[PDB]
Write a protein that binds this ligand. Sequence first.
Ligand SMILES: N[C@@H](Cc1ccc(OCc2ccccc2)cc1)CN(O)C(=O)CCCCC(=O)O
Ligand SMILES: [Yb+3]
Ligand SMILES: [Yb+3]
Ligand SMILES: [Yb+3]
Ligand SMILES: [Zn+2]
Length: 610
Amino acid sequence: PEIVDTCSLASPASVCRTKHLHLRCSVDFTRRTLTGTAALTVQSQEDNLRSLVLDTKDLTIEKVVINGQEVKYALGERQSYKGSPMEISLPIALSKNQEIVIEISFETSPKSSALQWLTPEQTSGKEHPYLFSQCQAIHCRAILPCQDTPSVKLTYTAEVSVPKELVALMSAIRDGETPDPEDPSRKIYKFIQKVPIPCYLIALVVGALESRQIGPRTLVWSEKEQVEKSAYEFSETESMLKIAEDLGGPYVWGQYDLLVLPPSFPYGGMENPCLTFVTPTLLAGDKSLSNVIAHEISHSWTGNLVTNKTWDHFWLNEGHTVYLERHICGRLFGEKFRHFNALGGWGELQNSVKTFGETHPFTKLVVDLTDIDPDVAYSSVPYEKGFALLFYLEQLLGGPEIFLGFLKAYVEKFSYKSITTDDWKDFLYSYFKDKVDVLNQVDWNAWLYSPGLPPIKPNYDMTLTNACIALSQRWITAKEDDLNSFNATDLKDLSSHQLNEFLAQTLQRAPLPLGHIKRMQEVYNFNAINNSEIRFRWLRLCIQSKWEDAIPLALKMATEQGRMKFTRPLFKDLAAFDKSHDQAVRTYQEHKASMHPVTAMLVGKDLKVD
Ligand SMILES: N[C@@H](Cc1ccc(OCc2ccccc2)cc1)CN(O)C(=O)CCCCC(=O)O
Ligand SMILES: [Yb+3]
Ligand SMILES: [Yb+3]
Ligand SMILES: [Yb+3]
Ligand SMILES: [Zn+2]
């Protein structure tokens, strides 16, 4: 029938569709508000459309103007994490394809779940405040009224007035800046996004930003203190974009800038169009965490051009993006490395399945988010079970070259559209019309709808994994007479990627005896490594193995940065260790007011506080 976006309270795409957004607002750090008007050009999809519903969350609505006049509107009661529905009465009944512009004057709440307002003390420079948004999945409604569903795509133009000493950037092409004629001291930045996008891709950052150009269509932005390191770390960006274009077809967004956010940014990155956001935890100093950049770049095709129609089909966004990500890395560092990463991904899937449990509905590839807060369901499953399905199909259908042909055709077929798993599978059969018999060998029901690990495991090259297995198994099975023989020389020919995999394998078998972990630090000096992925896994292993010396290190890492991938598991391990439990809870309570709103909520749920 009709696919329903169970995370939105707005009129569905089958009733009306927002085609354009014109945003005029001002950022006020003193009151922690964004105030302005949202001009929505809406297209009816039915005859006699007299009213529509938009999503909003903690928004103050002053008025709604249609054709210069103020119109009637009502706000329903709040529906938990979904916000409150906003019904707007149209002064004229619209018929199919007729359009109307609705201008809504609104003001965001300082507690907006889409935004994090940082005091100057929270920034690198200590002299200016900072602001950044994160709308995916459903927080756009916490910034402005909209049909907050990925099934709707719109273009947008924006004008943002900020303290003249600060810079504003958006998920759009920079369209110049000028003094705010209205009231000086403030400056106005203009933006234009001509490619239709789902509203979760609307992004804004305001702060003391500086840039460094690192490619013909790439500038790196961050506070002054991080510019140089960021410019160094992400130097391979243009080369990855060229590979991605070869894999997915032309890059259509124009600019591909990067913004290195403050430590509290909740994700590794966010594929905001024209301006990817990345965590500063990627600044390892050796470009080793660049797969995250390859990943956000890939989203420019899978996710931003071809978009999941509802969050129940989120794997379409992530599985294909991880698949592309790994091909980019394989083009740059070798097919063996692609397989090494693919296998590590299967290990992360094992971990997620174990955490949730093999019968947990959240381990299905296609999920049902009815009455489920997306932020709560988020996990590695759509990334890794989705990637595994695509990798398995690649092997079943003839190899990477053949499957990549499908990927490029898929992107072209559904560019600028929002689709479901059935659209994807129906096209796969259409593309592989000469291999229907092979496609019919796939246990689709299990892959798409069953919980747990996939029904079949792909084949993986083992070249780079073998040394990690050997070393991890030696530690897992080590006895007293083996401790003196481990030596720093064991790490001699291991890349940071392999050290991380070694730790991941060892962590799957934690706890290790306390004496064994103490010995590991003595011989490998992992406390000295600052690569966040490695430090994260090493501290988890230490805490899970009951080393009290590691408590302050883990509490430090969990609070000095806020990438949820790290912060949530660290607090969770600290809460599970009897020795650090009270300190973990007190540390969270002491820091929650200064944390990102979504991270604060999830860690509180994880710690069972309140
Ligand atoms: N799409 C963004 C990340 C992101 C941001 C926000 C959400 O929203 C939660 C959600 C969305 C859809 C379904 C269920 C839950 C989901 C993913 C880019 N991205 O996928 C990555 O950066 C992956 C790297 C992971 C590293 C990390 O620690 O974040
Ligand atoms: Yb007011
Ligand atoms: Yb106000
Ligand atoms: Yb022995
Ligand atoms: Zn992604």
